[PDB]
């Protein structure tokens, strides 16, 4: 059947799925600017755009 | 008609009382932290003096 998956195979699949969470986050968090805000609400912060 | 050579001694300046003007002689650009103020959805560009 073209729906439906194999109970067998689910930690399998699940396992492999859970790596490429993984592989696919791997990235280091770059550093981009900011503006200094005057919105009443967040009064004087710096909110990075 | 009034003839005479008279000279102008009443006159006005709306402007800027300075006589000195400071200049770029080698210009840069670098960096900033911050880019802009921001307002809501509004956002207002950094004028430095």
């Known amino acids: ?49 | 008609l009034l003839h005479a050579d008279t000279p102008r001694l009443v006159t006005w300046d709306a402007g800027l009382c300075t006589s000195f003007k400071i200049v770029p002689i080698v210009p840069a650009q670098v960096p900033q932290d911050v880019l802009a103020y921001t307002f809501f959805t509004s956002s207002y560009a950094i004028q430095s003096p």
């Open chain 1, 1 to 49: 059947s073209v729906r439906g998956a194999n109970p067998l195979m689910f930690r399998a699949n699940v396992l492999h799925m859970l790596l490429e969470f993984v592989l696919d986050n791997l990235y280091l968090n770059r550093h981009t600017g900011f503006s200094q805000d005057h919105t009443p609400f967040t009064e004087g912060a710096n909110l990075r755009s």
